[PDB]
Design an enzyme around this catalytic site. Sequence first.
Site, PDB file in Angstrom:
ATOM      1  N   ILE A  71     -23.306 -10.503   1.278  1.00 50.16           N
ATOM      2  CA  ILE A  71     -24.633 -10.144   0.348  1.00 50.16           C
ATOM      3  C   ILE A  71     -23.796  -9.281  -0.697  1.00 50.16           C
ATOM      4  O   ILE A  71     -23.374  -8.188  -0.176  1.00 50.16           O
ATOM      5  CB  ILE A  71     -25.750  -9.549   1.411  1.00 50.16           C
ATOM      6  N   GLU A 160     -25.018 -12.755   9.406  1.00 49.93           N
ATOM      7  CA  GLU A 160     -24.445 -12.550  10.775  1.00 49.93           C
ATOM      8  C   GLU A 160     -24.923 -13.811  11.781  1.00 49.93           C
ATOM      9  O   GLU A 160     -24.243 -14.364  12.443  1.00 49.93           O
ATOM     10  CB  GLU A 160     -24.661 -11.202  11.667  1.00 49.93           C
ATOM     11  N   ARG A 163     -23.090 -17.008  10.765  1.00 45.79           N
ATOM     12  CA  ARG A 163     -21.822 -16.607  11.281  1.00 45.79           C
ATOM     13  C   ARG A 163     -21.789 -16.898  13.010  1.00 45.79           C
ATOM     14  O   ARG A 163     -20.874 -17.487  13.210  1.00 45.79           O
ATOM     15  CB  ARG A 163     -21.186 -15.609  11.008  1.00 45.79           C
TER      16      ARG A 163
HETATM   17  C1  LIG Z   1     -20.005  -5.704   6.486  1.00 45.42           C
HETATM   18  C2  LIG Z   1     -20.670  -7.155   5.798  1.00 45.42           C
HETATM   19  O1  LIG Z   1     -21.332  -7.861   6.801  1.00 45.42           O
HETATM   20  C3  LIG Z   1     -21.543  -9.117   6.088  1.00 45.42           C
HETATM   21  O2  LIG Z   1     -20.421  -9.644   5.771  1.00 45.42           O
HETATM   22  C4  LIG Z   1     -22.528  -8.835   4.760  1.00 45.42           C
HETATM   23  O3  LIG Z   1     -22.607 -10.440   4.224  1.00 45.42           O
HETATM   24  C5  LIG Z   1     -21.764  -8.123   4.029  1.00 45.42           C
HETATM   25  O4  LIG Z   1     -22.449  -7.717   2.833  1.00 45.42           O
HETATM   26  C6  LIG Z   1     -21.373  -6.890   4.674  1.00 45.42           C
HETATM   27  O5  LIG Z   1     -22.321  -5.969   4.936  1.00 45.42           O
END
Ligand SMILES: C[C@H]1O[C@H](O)[C@H](O)[C@@H](O)[C@H]1O
Length: 246
Positions: A71, A160, A163
């Site tokens: 983000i 997250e 993912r």
């Molecule tokens: C630690 C990361 O976790 C994810 O990758 C978010 O998309 C990023 O913005 C950052 O917060």
Amino acid sequence: DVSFRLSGADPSSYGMFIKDLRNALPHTEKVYNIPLLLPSVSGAGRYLLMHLFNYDGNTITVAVDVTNVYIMGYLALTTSYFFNEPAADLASQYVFRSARRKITLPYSGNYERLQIAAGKPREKIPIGLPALDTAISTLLHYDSTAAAGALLVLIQTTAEAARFKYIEQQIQERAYRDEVPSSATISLENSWSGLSKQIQLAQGNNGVFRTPTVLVDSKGNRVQITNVTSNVVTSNIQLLLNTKNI
Ligand SMILES: C[C@H]1O[C@H](O)[C@H](O)[C@@H](O)[C@H]1O
Ligand SMILES: *[C@@H]1O[C@H](CO)[C@@H](O[C@@H]2O[C@H](CO)[C@@H](O)[C@H](O)[C@H]2NC(C)=O)[C@H](O)[C@H]1NC(C)=O
């Protein structure tokens, strides 16, 4: 773009949003049947827009770098907000240029800087759908301390979750009641790069990790992940950070 509405949301519409979020990330390759994120995307195509709507129907647009699910910032009404980091500064050349003004948040987007800013580790921050609703609401009006908390909640609920199927399911469980993330959730967030790398190295090493990945499991104790037959590989991770970005 992708959209998610808190009004009328339930475990199902949330699952559809995260599905949509995953499917919006371009890939040319699958490595062990997991979409492999692109090394780079130039210009404005690098950034996915997520339209998020709180329960009241107020909305923010979040800009996500499609190559890492990171983000970069968001637009709330006529103000844009971007993390204080080069990647986000680069992103502000492409997204939300129509905003009346642009505020650079007093922190980068990484978990450590967000947590210092928020005054709490994300271990101690409930997440879930009601919390994403709060987060969207907070982000609508600038308050940098409150926004750091709201951003931690928002990162975990959208990126997250995209993912890792396990984290998407964690949130689905928290559809109507927030709860701090499990240690397993924290372990996955922190291990994504790591896993992404070892999954990719495994091609060429007979599905074996070059270096094992230590995780925490559901029940609470450490577990060592060493190859692609592991559940976290076969069932849980949904997107691979390209080793070109690690
Ligand atoms: C630690 C990361 O976790 C994810 O990758 C978010 O998309 C990023 O913005 C950052 O917060
Ligand atoms: C691939 O990973 C699996 C684990 O996901 C390994 O099998 C496990 O490891 C030992 C036995 O060798 C036990 O502690 C686990 O209970 C096993 N689990 C299962 C489901 O089999 C396996 O050994 C690994 N294979 C390679 C080639 O590294």
